[PDB]
DNA sequence: GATCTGACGCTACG
DNA sequence: CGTAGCGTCA
């Protein structure tokens, strides 16, 4: 009533007073209101409606009486986002004051609490439009209770606001988040918005307290929170793709698919669903009985084992590959398109490993290596990453963390031989020197295939699981791969020692911790079932490495983003992050100056205090550049 | 009839 | 190990 005001209808003196209130505010509590009107506080993942406006609660306390006279205390202000039916000058004015207020929200010195902060920051960033760049939201820090709850319990599915209230909030606080226009009135909706914003503040404070109790607070403030505006920028941008070339490629792969289907039907001597694993299993073992020769599944390991026994496995392999490419990396990528470009949706709450996840399309899972197709009705090379092209004039600048998992494992284990390997620098093709040291065969004899074996051999180690894939990915029988693994294991003892320490810690504390303090509770480490316990054990050792590497990647992301954020020259925009790799879109003449800053910043992550972290191994960064994500020539 | 849906296989990425 | 996404089938 007097607690809720549309800022468009304020008198100008009241507008100025409002700006000053925002500057002097103790805290700001924010939520997005949709056209329902519902909020982020209600229960939907998708609100199935457009953003209408933004509601901000301005808290004068977290000293003395205050009478503004144009509002009560503490007031809720409403900022219209959604465009009117007709654009005119008054809309321009409204937009001007709105932009001023929202920016005041972005740069204010008080705590800002928002349930989903990335959404808010994205909305605001798009609302600025031409009046603002991505660097305006760069310094924003929202307090996101969902990210807090995630840091505490990363396993649990992403809870609603109400769930978080019933869980971390004490006590007997009941909220009504489900009001909309038409199930209720405007006054009910608004009243509930105000009350629930207060509750949201309370909850956020409690969750901060908990984060301090579990020792997650420094991680929260410094890693997760500053990452929020960075995801919003990436979602606001778009990467241009080629619709035509993709349609052609789609048609071609369709043709080849038809060919392989006909072949498969021919050599199995029956007509069966080519995309059915059940039928293929029945065929492979049911009839041909290839397993008795020299039921098991249809996985690539099995099929690579049988490749010499019969034609069908090789056919199924090629078909599976081509079908994957066409279907996910061409046809599915066209469905994500808007206006000739695509933009992935990022999720910070996605994993238990602390890694980011991406959607629509999944840009982290796009095949790195191009494939070859025996063109049906010349050879044909197909690179899905070549479909991603930079704007003009602009060019992609990639920064990779070289052997990051291996270096993390070296740090954690402290193995003398690996540490000796990395601290002679660069002398890279580190996997070659590793092959030589491991296999005791001197350096030159080491070939590219041995480098590959070494890398596969490593990754299989760091990640695990293991004998089976290693074999499938390496192109060698399972037993040979397992032998390689065991050799590698007794060559470096401190790795087994490290895993053993990690499992012991997991049994002791009931949960395992990464480098920067990210925690992975694993209650099944205390389980009586042996496969569950052994699973938990397998999960801990993985979480240490994967979690640590995720921490480092996020940290690099933040530091580079911040470095470019304050530069009066560089316009370089962070486009994507695929795990170990950062993908930037940089204006051409800025390439040399930008690559320098990126390299220098990421390599400076070896020692960053606080965080406490210091590394026993230096971080080598590999820079690349090119007009297409598919073709990137090495740089420097 | 005709679609649809939850549960599982497979394997790209790291 | 653990993400997304595309595919069956009862
Ligand atoms: Na008006």
Q: What is the 3-state secondary structure (H, E, C) of A490-541?
A: HHCHHHHHHHHHHHHHHHHHCEEECCCCCEEECHHHHCCCHHHHHHHHHHHH
d(CA A460, CA A467): 8
Asked if the peptide bond before residue A446 counts as cis, ω within 30 degrees of 0, the response is no
Compute, in angstroms, the gap from residue A96 CA to the centroid of ligand 1. 13
Residues A322 and A253 sit within 8 Å (Cβ to Cβ) = yes
Looking across all nucleic acid strands, the nucleotide with the smallest C1' to CA distance from residue A275 is: C7
| Nearest Cα to Cα of residue A201 among A263, A111, A124, A336 | A111
Resolution rounded to one decimal, in angstroms: 3.3
Which DSSP category does A344 fall into? P
Distance in Å, residue A4 CA to nucleotide B14 C1': 49
* Cα torsion angle, A191, A194, A195, A197, sign: positive
Residues A177 and A43 sit within 8 Å (Cβ to Cβ) = yes
- Whether the CB of A365 is less than 7 Å away from nucleic strand B comes out as yes
Question: What's the Cα-to-Cα distance from A105 to each of A55, A118, A279, rounded to whole Å?
Answer: 11, 14, 59
Residues A179 and A187 sit within 8 Å (Cβ to Cβ) = no
- Whether the CB of A371 is less than 7 Å away from nucleic strand B comes out as no
Distance in Å, residue A438 CA to nucleotide C3 C1': 32
**Most distant CA atoms of chain A, gap in Å:** 90
- Give the three-state DSSP class for A299: coil
Alpha helix ranges (H) inside A327-370: 332-334
Distance in Å, residue A521 CA to nucleotide B12 C1': 29
d(CA A598, CA A555): 13
In three-state form (DSSP H/G/I as H, E/B as E, the rest C), the secondary structure along A152-183 is HCCCCCCCCHHHHHHHHCCCCCCCCCCCCECC
Torsions phi, psi of A41, nearest 5? -80, -20
- Mode of pairing for the β-strands spanning A621-626 and A395-401: antiparallel
Residues A522 and A511 sit within 8 Å (Cβ to Cβ) = yes
Distance in Å, residue A50 CA to nucleotide B4 C1': 28
- Give the three-state DSSP class for A138: coil
Token look-up 């996997």 returns A431
Distance in Å, residue A379 CA to nucleotide B10 C1': 27
β-sheet bridge partners, residue A372 = A381
Which bases along strand B come within 7 Å of a protein CB atom?
A: 9-14
- Whether the CB of A357 is less than 7 Å away from nucleic strand B comes out as no
Q: Where does residue A615 rank: exposed (0-12), middle (13-18), buried (19+ CB within 10 A)?
A: middle
Distance in Å, residue A260 CA to nucleotide C4 C1': 26
Tokens of A191: 């009243």
Residues A488 and A457 sit within 8 Å (Cβ to Cβ) = yes
Residues A470 and A484 sit within 8 Å (Cβ to Cβ) = yes
Query: Which residues, 6 or more positions from A28, have their beta carbon under 8 angstroms from its beta carbon?
Result: A22, A56, A57, A58, A59, A105, A108, A110, A111, A112, A113
**Beta strands across the sheet bearing A573-578:** A573-578, A581-586, A395-401, A621-626, A633-634
In this structure, whether the domain defined by A404-550 belongs to CATH 1.10.150.20 is answered with: yes
- Whether the CB of A367 is less than 7 Å away from nucleic strand B comes out as yes
Which bases along strand C come within 7 Å of a protein CB atom?
A: 1-9
Q: Where are the beta strands (DSSP E) in A160-249?
A: 239-241
| Per-residue b or e along A585-609, where b marks 16 or more CB atoms closer than 10 Å to that residue's CB | bbbeebbeebbebbbebbeebeebe
Of all residues in chain A, what percent are helix, strand and coil, respectively (each to 5)?
50, 15, 35
Looking across all nucleic acid strands, the nucleotide with the smallest C1' to CA distance from residue A465 is: C1
d(CA A595, CA A590): 8
- Whether the CB of A324 is less than 7 Å away from nucleic strand B comes out as yes
Distance in Å, residue A342 CA to nucleotide B14 C1': 22
For residues A28, A123, A366 and A592, what is the CA-based torsion angle, rounded to 10 degrees?
A: -80
β-sheet bridge partners, residue A53 = A33, A80
DSSP code per residue over A610-636: SS--B-SS---EEEEEESBSS--EE--
Distance in Å, residue A275 CA to nucleotide B1 C1': 26
Compute, in angstroms, the gap from residue A9 CA to the centroid of ligand 1. 7
d(CA A620, CA A318): 36
Compute, in angstroms, the gap from residue A95 CA to the centroid of ligand 1. 11
Torsions phi, psi of A112, nearest 5? -115, 120
Which DSSP category does A225 fall into? G
| Nearest Cα to Cα of residue A515 among A422, A430, A619 | A619
| Per-residue b or e along A319-353, where b marks 16 or more CB atoms closer than 10 Å to that residue's CB | bbbbbebbbbbbbebeebbeeebbbbbbebbbbbb
Q: Where does residue A99 rank: exposed (0-12), middle (13-18), buried (19+ CB within 10 A)?
A: middle
d(CA A372, CA A571): 37
d(CA A586, CA A572): 4
| Nearest Cα to Cα of residue A57 among A115, A121, A119, A100 | A115
Tokens of A309: 């026994």
Looking across all nucleic acid strands, the nucleotide with the smallest C1' to CA distance from residue A466 is: C1
Q: How far is CA A231 from the centre of its chain?
A: 9
Q: Where does residue A507 rank: exposed (0-12), middle (13-18), buried (19+ CB within 10 A)?
A: middle
CA atoms lying within 13 Å on the CB side of residue A411: 22
- Whether the CB of A297 is less than 7 Å away from nucleic strand B comes out as yes
d(CA A363, CA A234): 12
Distance in Å, residue A539 CA to nucleotide B10 C1': 22
Compute, in angstroms, the gap from residue A429 CA to the centroid of ligand 1. 66
Looking across all nucleic acid strands, the nucleotide with the smallest C1' to CA distance from residue A363 is: B13
Distance in Å, residue A328 CA to nucleotide B2 C1': 28
Looking across all nucleic acid strands, the nucleotide with the smallest C1' to CA distance from residue A401 is: B14
| Nearest Cα to Cα of residue A510 among A524, A496, A499 | A524
Protein chain A, residues 207-226, with a C-beta closer than 7 Å to any atom of nucleic acid strand B: none
Residue nearest to nucleotide C3 (CA to C1'): A357
Q: How far is CA A286 from the centre of its chain?
A: 42
β-sheet bridge partners, residue A585 = A396, A573
β-sheet bridge partners, residue A400 = A581, A622
d(CA A158, CA A468): 33
Compute, in angstroms, the gap from residue A84 CA to the centroid of ligand 1. 10
Helix axes A591-603, A530-565, angle to 10 degrees: 140
d(CA A56, CA A77): 5
Residue A515 burial (CB count, 10 A): 22
Token look-up 């290693």 returns A470
Which DSSP category does A257 fall into? H
Q: Where does residue A486 rank: exposed (0-12), middle (13-18), buried (19+ CB within 10 A)?
A: exposed
Protein side of the strand C interface (CB < 7 A): A 273, 275-279, 323, 327-328, 332, 335, 347, 350-353, 355, 357-362, 364-365, 463-465, 469, 535, 538-539, 542-543, 546
Distance in Å, residue A12 CA to nucleotide B7 C1': 60
Compute, in angstroms, the gap from residue A8 CA to the centroid of ligand 1. 7
Compute, in angstroms, the gap from residue A175 CA to the centroid of ligand 1. 32
Which DSSP category does A340 fall into? T
d(CA A598, CA A584): 10
Query: Which residues, 6 or more positions from A505, have their beta carbon under 8 angstroms from its beta carbon?
Result: A512, A513, A540
Distance in Å, residue A431 CA to nucleotide B11 C1': 25
d(CA A40, CA A582): 30
Distance in Å, residue A402 CA to nucleotide C3 C1': 21
Residues A55 and A31 sit within 8 Å (Cβ to Cβ) = yes
Looking across all nucleic acid strands, the nucleotide with the smallest C1' to CA distance from residue A278 is: C8
């Amino acid at each position: 009533k007097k607690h809720f005001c549309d800022i468009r209808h304020l008198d100008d003196w009241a507008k100025s007073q409002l700006i000053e209130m925002l500057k002097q505010a103790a805290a700001l509590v924010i939520t997005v209101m949709y056209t329902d009107g519902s909020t982020q506080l209600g229960a939907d993942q998708t609100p199935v409606s457009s953003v209408r406006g933004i509601v901000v609660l301005v808290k004068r306390q977290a000293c003395g009486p205050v009478l503004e006279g144009f509002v009560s205390d503490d007031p809720c202000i409403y900022i219209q986002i959604e465009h009117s039916a007709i654009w005119d000058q008054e809309q321009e004015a409204h937009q001007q004051f709105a932009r001023n207020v929202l920016f005041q929200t972005m740069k204010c010195k008080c705590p800002v609490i928002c349930f989903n902060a990335k959404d808010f920051v994205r909305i605001v960033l798009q609302f600025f439009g031409n009046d603002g760049s991505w660097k305006h939201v760069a310094d924003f820090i929202g307090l996101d209770p969902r990210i807090a709850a995630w840091l505490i319990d990363p396993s649990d599915a992403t809870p609603s606001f109400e769930d978080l209230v019933e869980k971390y909030c004490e006590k007997s606080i009941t909220v009504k988040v489900n009001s909309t226009y038409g199930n209720s009135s405007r006054n009910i909706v608004n009243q509930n918005v105000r009350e629930n914003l207060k509750t949201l503040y309370r909850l956020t404070m409690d969750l901060c307290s908990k984060l301090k109790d579990y020792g997650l607070w420094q991680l929260f403030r410094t890693l997760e929170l500053p990452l929020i505006p960075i995801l919003a920028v990436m979602e606001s941008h778009a990467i241009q793709v080629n619709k035509e070339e993709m349609e052609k490629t789609s048609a071609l792969l369709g043709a080849r698919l038809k060919e392989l289907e006909q072949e498969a039907h021919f050599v199995a001597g029956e007509r069966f669903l080519i995309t059915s694993n059940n039928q293929l299993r029945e065929i492979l073992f049911g009839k041909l009985k290839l397993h008795l020769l020299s039921y098991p599944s249809t996985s690539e390991a099995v099929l690579n084992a049988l490749r010499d026994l019969h034609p069908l496995p090789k056919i199924i392999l090629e078909y599976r590959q081509v079908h994957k490419i066409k279907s996910t990396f061409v046809d599915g990528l066209l469905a994500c398109m808007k206006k000739g470009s695509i933009s992935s949706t990022w999720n910070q709450t996605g994993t238990v490993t602390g890694r980011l996840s991406a959607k629509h399309p999944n840009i982290q899972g796009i095949s790195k290596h191009p494939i070859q197709i025996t063109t049906p009705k010349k050879i044909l090379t197909i690179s899905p990453r070549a479909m991603f092209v930079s704007s003009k004039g602009h060019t992609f600048l990639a920064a990779d963390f070289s052997q990051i998992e291996l270096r993390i494992l070296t740090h954690l284990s402290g193995d003398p031989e690996l540490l000796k390997l990395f601290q002679e620098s660069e002398r890279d093709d580190v996997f070659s020197t590793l092959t030589s040291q491991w296999k005791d065969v001197p350096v030159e004899q080491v070939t590219h295939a041995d480098r590959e074996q070494t890398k596969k051999v490593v990754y299989a180690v760091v990640y695990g699981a293991g004998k089976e894939r290693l074999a499938a990915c390496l192109g060698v029988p399972i037993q040979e791969a397992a032998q390689f693994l065991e050799s590698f294991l007794q060559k470096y003892k401190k790795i087994k020692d490290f895993a053993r320490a990690a499992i012991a810690q997991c049994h002791q504390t009931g949960c395992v911790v990464s480098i920067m303090g990210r925690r992975r509770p694993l209650p099944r480490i205390h389980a009586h079932d042996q496969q569950l316990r052994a699973q938990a054990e397998r999960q801990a050792v993985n979480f240490v490495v994967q979690g640590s590497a995720a921490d480092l990647c996020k940290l690099a992301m933040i530091h580079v983003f911040t470095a470019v954020a304050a530069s009066h020259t560089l316009t370089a925009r962070l486009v994507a992050q695929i795990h170990d790799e950062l993908l930037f879109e940089v204006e051409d003449p800025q390439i040399p100056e930008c690559a320098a800053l990126v390299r220098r910043t990421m390599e400076s992550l070896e020692q960053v205090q606080a965080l406490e972290l210091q590394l026993q191994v230096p971080l080598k960064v590999s820079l690349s550049a090119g007009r297409s994500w598919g073709h990137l020539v090495p740089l420097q």
